[PDB]
Design an enzyme around this catalytic site. Structure first.
Site, short mmCIF file in Angstrom:
data_model
loop_
_atom_site.label_atom_id
_atom_site.label_comp_id
_atom_site.label_asym_id
_atom_site.label_seq_id
_atom_site.Cartn_x
_atom_site.Cartn_y
_atom_site.Cartn_z
N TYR B 312 0.85 -1.23 0.00
CA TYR B 312 -0.04 -0.05 -0.04
C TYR B 312 0.78 1.50 0.04
O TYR B 312 0.58 2.18 -0.45
CB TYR B 312 -1.07 -0.02 1.21
CG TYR B 312 -1.92 -1.11 1.11
CD1 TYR B 312 -3.07 -0.84 0.27
CD2 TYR B 312 -2.05 -2.24 1.85
CE1 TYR B 312 -4.11 -1.80 0.14
CE2 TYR B 312 -2.76 -3.06 1.86
CZ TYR B 312 -4.06 -2.74 1.04
OH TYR B 312 -5.02 -3.83 0.88
N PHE B 315 1.54 2.05 -3.50
CA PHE B 315 0.39 2.59 -4.05
C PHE B 315 0.22 4.25 -3.71
O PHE B 315 -0.13 4.96 -4.53
CB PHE B 315 -0.82 2.05 -3.68
CG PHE B 315 -0.88 0.54 -4.19
CD1 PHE B 315 0.00 0.16 -4.78
CD2 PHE B 315 -1.83 -0.38 -3.79
CE1 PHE B 315 0.01 -1.45 -5.27
CE2 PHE B 315 -2.04 -1.44 -3.96
CZ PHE B 315 -1.05 -1.99 -4.66
N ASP B 407 -16.41 -7.40 1.95
CA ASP B 407 -16.16 -7.72 0.42
C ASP B 407 -17.52 -6.71 -0.11
O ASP B 407 -18.89 -6.88 0.14
CB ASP B 407 -16.39 -8.91 0.04
CG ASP B 407 -15.97 -9.25 -1.24
OD1 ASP B 407 -16.51 -8.56 -2.00
OD2 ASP B 407 -15.18 -10.08 -1.45
N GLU B 423 -10.11 1.56 -7.31
CA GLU B 423 -8.86 1.32 -7.65
C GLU B 423 -8.59 -0.21 -8.02
O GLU B 423 -7.58 -0.36 -7.28
CB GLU B 423 -7.93 2.35 -6.83
CG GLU B 423 -6.41 2.32 -7.56
CD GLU B 423 -5.46 3.04 -6.66
OE1 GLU B 423 -5.87 3.30 -5.46
OE2 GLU B 423 -4.25 3.19 -7.09
N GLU B 432 -7.16 -7.99 -12.25
CA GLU B 432 -7.49 -7.95 -10.78
C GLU B 432 -8.99 -8.26 -10.50
O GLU B 432 -9.50 -8.06 -9.39
CB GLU B 432 -7.18 -6.95 -10.18
CG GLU B 432 -5.45 -6.64 -10.03
CD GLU B 432 -5.11 -5.58 -9.13
OE1 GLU B 432 -5.73 -4.97 -8.80
OE2 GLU B 432 -3.61 -5.31 -9.12
C1 LIG Z 1 3.72 -6.56 -9.09
N1 LIG Z 1 2.46 -5.68 -9.23
N2 LIG Z 1 1.28 -6.12 -9.83
C2 LIG Z 1 0.42 -4.96 -9.84
C3 LIG Z 1 1.16 -3.98 -9.09
C4 LIG Z 1 0.69 -2.49 -8.82
C5 LIG Z 1 1.34 -1.35 -8.72
C6 LIG Z 1 0.66 -0.32 -8.47
C7 LIG Z 1 -0.74 0.01 -8.07
C8 LIG Z 1 -1.27 1.12 -7.91
O1 LIG Z 1 -0.69 2.25 -7.98
N3 LIG Z 1 -2.69 1.04 -7.89
N4 LIG Z 1 -3.47 -0.14 -7.76
C9 LIG Z 1 -2.80 -1.29 -7.91
C10 LIG Z 1 -3.65 -2.61 -8.15
N5 LIG Z 1 -5.11 -2.14 -8.09
C11 LIG Z 1 -1.46 -1.29 -8.17
C12 LIG Z 1 -0.82 -2.41 -8.64
C13 LIG Z 1 2.35 -4.36 -9.01
C14 LIG Z 1 3.52 -3.84 -8.10
C15 LIG Z 1 3.89 -3.93 -6.70
C16 LIG Z 1 4.94 -3.39 -6.00
C17 LIG Z 1 5.81 -2.70 -6.74
C18 LIG Z 1 6.91 -1.97 -6.12
C19 LIG Z 1 7.84 -1.00 -6.76
C20 LIG Z 1 7.51 -0.77 -8.15
C21 LIG Z 1 6.42 -1.41 -8.83
C22 LIG Z 1 5.66 -2.53 -8.03
C23 LIG Z 1 4.43 -2.91 -8.55
C24 LIG Z 1 4.33 -2.47 -10.27
N6 LIG Z 1 4.06 -2.31 -11.43
C1 LIG Z 2 -5.80 -0.34 -4.19
S1 LIG Z 2 -5.41 -2.17 -4.60
C2 LIG Z 2 -7.04 -2.90 -4.58
C3 LIG Z 2 -7.75 -2.56 -3.11
O1 LIG Z 2 -8.99 -3.15 -3.33
C4 LIG Z 2 -9.62 -4.06 -2.18
N1 LIG Z 2 -10.50 -4.80 -2.62
C5 LIG Z 2 -10.26 -5.65 -3.75
N2 LIG Z 2 -11.29 -6.44 -4.15
C6 LIG Z 2 -12.28 -6.08 -3.48
C7 LIG Z 2 -13.51 -6.34 -2.90
N3 LIG Z 2 -14.14 -7.44 -3.52
N4 LIG Z 2 -14.13 -5.84 -1.81
C8 LIG Z 2 -13.65 -5.25 -1.06
N5 LIG Z 2 -12.31 -4.61 -1.22
C9 LIG Z 2 -11.79 -5.20 -2.28
C10 LIG Z 2 -8.11 -4.55 -1.99
O2 LIG Z 2 -8.00 -5.52 -0.76
C11 LIG Z 2 -7.35 -3.47 -1.84
O3 LIG Z 2 -7.32 -2.75 -0.76
#
Ligand SMILES: Cn1ncc(-c2ccc3c(=O)[nH]nc(CN)c3c2)c1-c1ccc2ccccc2c1C#N
Ligand SMILES: CSC[C@H]1O[C@@H](n2cnc3c(N)ncnc32)[C@H](O)[C@@H]1O
Lengths: 305, 625
Positions: B312, B315, B407, B423, B432
């Site tokens: 997170y 993110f 959920d 998101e 996803e």
């Molecule tokens: C391997 N992976 N698969 C998805 C992701 C990802 C990345 C960003 C977001 C986001 O910003 N929002 N939401 C989501 C999901 N909904 C989200 C998901 C990663 C990830 C994981 C850790 C990192 C650490 C360092 C660098 C890149 C990443 C990456 C990459 N790209």
């Molecule tokens: C921002 S990455 C996606 C976020 O949504 C949440 N999420 C994904 N699917 C669901 C769902 N079906 N219900 C509630 N939260 C969800 C994940 O646990 C994470 O916090």
């Protein structure tokens, strides 16, 4: 034991050449061990070589000696591993071997060198695929040609045409050169890679070449005779100074051979135990022939004429 | 700092030579381990019994020096593919001898030439050496951009040089490398030492080496031009190639003698340092994404799995992403609440998948700058992140935010929502299960409710990258299908690769989905024109999404959201590489498949050659519902 002459001579004897009076020029390389370099030696007593204690003059080079040749009676032109073509000269007393110039123009090992007819210019070949024409007086490169596509194995100057010379490379090309033509190179025609070249001394348009498979061939400019002389690569081809000259051939099979006008065998010597690198006919005794090799032997053959 | 080495074919004394090379500024030295003129016999007498030593002693350098300073070189006389049998036998034994001596020294790299078309036996001997022990040594195949025969001077009267263009003939050197590494079975230890020539070939010839495992670039001193002050410089076209190579972080090698004898020899190297300092520093993204180049990552499944705390945090370190969200919420509030209803109308905003609450704060900031009243629900099924939300709600948000640990597909909302914010998108948009999640939350969205994002679309593009294929290939695991690694996608910062065509849309989803017969399964056929020759290894995936009206997020390169660190591209590999000629069309098929438990992708190449259908029935990869 002359001054500034090394006490130990390198093992791999690479070149041996006689000059007019009969003195022997030697080139050696250190192809193994801690130091990889070379040396130049003058033996006015040919039967004393390769003993350093009984030499006329000697000197050390910074790198190995891949090829050399006389430049007159006191000049020594050297193809160095360092990519440099070097010119050494004997002093007035012929007890030292002093460096005239050392110019680094080739990007890889300089493998072959030859002096043109006028004695004022020389052509060099190298593993950098290039062939350079030198001005020995100005100590500069007149022309740099890149006609081949692989490393150049041998370059041999014409005996009486100062602008003509031969060259062979591992691109399977034998190139006849003439700097008088806008395109100076000309190819002479599938066979095995050529490895040695020798103009005919008494025929302007005739030369011989050996290949990597042991064949010595007799070639004219335009219309072939060949004989399998060796079991391995043909390293050198040197014509004798007789009226009707003999042909001495060298090889990595550790054997010397002497051939007549029709490439037939007249003499054979297996006295060497390593590669046979150079051969030079005595000017005093035309029947004597001296060879050197990597076994550090300097053999004086009596060739039955 | 540039990592550079010196190439020499003449070393009289190792100690003296290596000291001079170091004082000039180099990091390593390419030298022969045997004398390049020291031809050695192995069969015929008496030359085979030549007394030793066969080369220099290993004691002349420390073990640390051999491990980090020396790069070995095969001897030039060794021709394993010679037409003469005796030359082959001696070359085979000599190649083993020299290679084994390098491994004996622990050398980190060994240089071998690719100077002709047929290197079949050379490949067999090298492949045999690679499978003779467990070693990590690299083998740099010295191969030129332009073959020597194609750059020789037009000075042979009865054999001129061709002037008509040969589009494939000018690419012959890449075929030399391609066939060689194909014979060697894509060995990880075999890389490319690209030798740059005086005359650069056409751009397509240079583009052939895109995605190839280039580890070194060899710059002969012969190609350096001369400025007014006599210092070696490069043409602007050469500078262009140097910059592309600096991005691959290759090691540069200087070969040839000093042709600028006035200046000392370190003038060439100082110019490489000069060019390196003169390029833009890491621009935010490249500062964040550096270190992840061509690093394979399993795609996050935030529905099936509960994300860790530091995930997170990744993110949340992207303000540009959430300011786009805030702007989307801002515009939506103004369009739903007129000015006269600013005080009486309170919009019900529901963040579906709130994580640690970055969207919640973005919603709060949006209502403030829009001067509107909102009632916030923060839905999150990850109970560990609910801990973060509830400590937030007690200490800052207050009763305005209602945290719901449930959920979104099962939560029974006490009221219907005016706006739902989510998101749930991955690198491939819907990978996803954002459609499945928002479909289940659709019931508590008002009849005129707005979903942010409103739609998203995934894009695919054929790519060429022998390195990434090798990286995927090295993901075989003990207790599964030996080819399962080829039937699953990877999130990866695509670096050393070549995109073969412009990306095209693949899957699209809209929210809310008013359609009565909702089906998230998909089947899409794409045809990618290819205007080059190459080898197809996989398909890169991107996505675009509409948050609201004109506000978007995008990792699609032609429309990449500028300054957004989030989301690397996704990579779909194929089991077997596929040769593609110039003008041919690459046709790929993609299916989005699902059942009650899982959702997965299936893909197949149908032109110019058919591949096997990848991941059938999700046998190697599924996305849990
Ligand atoms: C391997 N992976 N698969 C998805 C992701 C990802 C990345 C960003 C977001 C986001 O910003 N929002 N939401 C989501 C999901 N909904 C989200 C998901 C990663 C990830 C994981 C850790 C990192 C650490 C360092 C660098 C890149 C990443 C990456 C990459 N790209
Ligand atoms: C921002 S990455 C996606 C976020 O949504 C949440 N999420 C994904 N699917 C669901 C769902 N079906 N219900 C509630 N939260 C969800 C994940 O646990 C994470 O916090």
């Amino acid at each position: 034991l002359p001054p500034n002459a090394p006490a130990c001579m390198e093992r791999q004897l690479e070149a041996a050449r006689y000059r007019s009076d009969g003195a022997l020029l030697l080139g050696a390389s250190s192809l193994s061990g801690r130091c990889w370099a070379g040396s130049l030696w003058l033996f006015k007593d040919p039967c004393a070589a390769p003993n350093e204690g009984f030499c006329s003059a000697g000197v050390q080079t910074e790198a190995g000696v891949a090829d050399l040749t006389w430049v007159g009676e006191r000049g020594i032109l050297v193809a160095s591993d360092s990519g440099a073509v070097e010119l050494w000269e004997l002093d007035e007393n012929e007890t030292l071997i002093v460096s005239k110039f050392c110019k680094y123009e080739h990007d890889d090992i300089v493998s072959t060198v030859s002096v043109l007819s006028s004695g004022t210019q020389a052509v060099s070949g190298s593993k950098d695929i290039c062939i350079k024409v030198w001005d020995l007086a100005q100590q500069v490169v007149l022309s740099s040609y890149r006609a081949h596509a692989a490393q150049v194995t041998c370059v041999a100057a014409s005996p009486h045409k100062d602008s003509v010379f031969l060259s062979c490379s591992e691109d399977n090309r034998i190139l006849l050169w003439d700097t008088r033509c806008p395109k100076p190179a000309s190819q002479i025609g599938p066979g095995y890679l050529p490895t040695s070249l020798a103009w005919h001394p008494q025929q302007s348009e005739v030369f011989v070449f050996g290949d990597e498979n042991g064949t010595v061939s007799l070639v004219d400019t335009k219309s072939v005779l060949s004989s399998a002389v060796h079991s391995q690569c043909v390293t050198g081809l040197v014509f004798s100074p007789h009226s009707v000259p003999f042909l001495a051939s060298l090889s990595e099979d550790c054997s010397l051979a002497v051939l007549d006008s029709s490439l037939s065998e007249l003499f054979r010597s297996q006295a060497h135990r390593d590669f046979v690198r150079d051969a030079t006919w005595s000017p005093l005794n035309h029947s004597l022939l001296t060879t050197v090799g990597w076994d550090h032997q300097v053999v004086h053959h009596v060739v039955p004429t | 700092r540039v990592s550079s080495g010196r190439d020499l074919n003449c070393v009289p004394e190792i100690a003296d030579t290596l000291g001079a090379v170091a004082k000039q500024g180099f990091d390593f030295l390419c030298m022969p381990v045997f004398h390049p003129r020291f031809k050695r016999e192995f069969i015929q007498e008496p030359a085979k019994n030549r007394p030793g030593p066969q080369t220099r002693s290993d004691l002349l350098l420390s073990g640390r020096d051999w491990n980090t300073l020396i790069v070995g070189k095969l001897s030039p006389w060794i021709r394993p593919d010679s037409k003469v049998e005796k030359i082959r036998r001696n070359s085979e034994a000599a190649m083993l001898q020299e290679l084994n001596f390098g491994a004996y020294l622990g050398l980190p790299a060994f240089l071998l030439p690719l100077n002709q078309e047929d290197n079949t036996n050379l490949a067999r001997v090298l492949t045999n050496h690679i499978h003779t022990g467990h070693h990590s040594s690299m083998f740099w195949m010295r191969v030129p951009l332009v073959a020597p025969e194609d750059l020789r001077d037009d000075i042979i009267e009865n054999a001129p040089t061709t002037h008509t263009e040969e589009y494939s003939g000018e690419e012959k050197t890449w075929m030399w490398w391609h066939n060689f590494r194909t014979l060697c079975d894509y060995s990880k230890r075999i890389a490319v030492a690209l030798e740059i020539g005086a005359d650069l070939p056409s751009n397509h010839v240079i583009d052939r080496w895109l995605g190839e495992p280039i580890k070194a670039a060899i710059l002969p001193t012969s190609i350096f031009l001369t400025n007014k002050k006599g210092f070696p410089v490069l043409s602007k076209m050469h500078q262009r190639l140097i910059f592309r190579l600096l991005k691959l972080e290759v090691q540069f090698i200087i070969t040839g003698t000093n042709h600028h004898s006035e200046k000392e020899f370190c003038s060439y190297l100082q110019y490489l340092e000069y060019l390196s300092q003169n390029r833009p520093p890491p621009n935010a993204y490249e500062l964040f994404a550096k270190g992840y180049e061509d690093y394979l990552q399993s795609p996050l499944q935030p529905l099936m799995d509960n994300l860790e705390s530091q995930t997170y945090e990744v993110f949340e370190k992207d303000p540009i992403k959430y300011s786009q969200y805030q702007q989307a919420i801002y515009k939506c509030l103004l369009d739903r609440v007129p000015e006269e209803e600013k005080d009486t109308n309170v919009q019900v905003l529901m963040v579906l998948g709130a994580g640690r609450g970055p969207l919640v704060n973005a919603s709060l900031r949006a209502a403030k700058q829009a001067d509107r009243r909102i009632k916030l629900y923060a839905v999150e099924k990850n109970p560990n992140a609910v801990v973060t939300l509830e400590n937030w709600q007690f200490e800052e948000w207050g009763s305005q935010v209602t945290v719901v640990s449930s959920d979104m597909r099962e939560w029974v909302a006490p009221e219907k929502a005016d706006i739902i914010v989510s998101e749930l998108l991955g690198s491939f948009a819907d990978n996803e299960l954002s459609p499945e999640c928002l479909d289940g939350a659709q019931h508590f969205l008002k009849d005129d409710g707005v979903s942010i994002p409103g739609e998203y679309t995934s894009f695919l593009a054929p790519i060429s990258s022998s390195k990434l294929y090798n990286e995927v290939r090295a993901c075989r695991e003990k207790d599964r299908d030996p080819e399962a690694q080829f039937e699953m996608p990877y999130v990866v910062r695509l670096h050393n690769f070549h995109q073969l065509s412009a990306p095209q849309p693949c899957f699209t989803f809209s929210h809310p989905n008013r359609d009565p017969m909702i089906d998230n399964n998909r089947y899409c056929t794409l045809e990618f024109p290819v205007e080059v020759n190459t080898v197809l290894h996989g398909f890169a995936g991107y996505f675009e999404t509409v948050l609201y009206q004109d506000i978007t997020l995008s990792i699609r390169p032609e429309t990449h959201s500028p300054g957004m660190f989030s989301w690397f591209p996704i990579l779909f590999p194929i089991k077997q590489p596929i040769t593609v000629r110039e003008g041919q069309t690459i046709c790929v098929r993609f299916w989005r498949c699902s059942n009650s438990k899982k959702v997965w992708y299936e893909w197949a190449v149908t032109a110019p050659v058919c591949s096997a259908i990848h991941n059938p029935t999700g046998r190697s990869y599924t996305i849990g519902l």
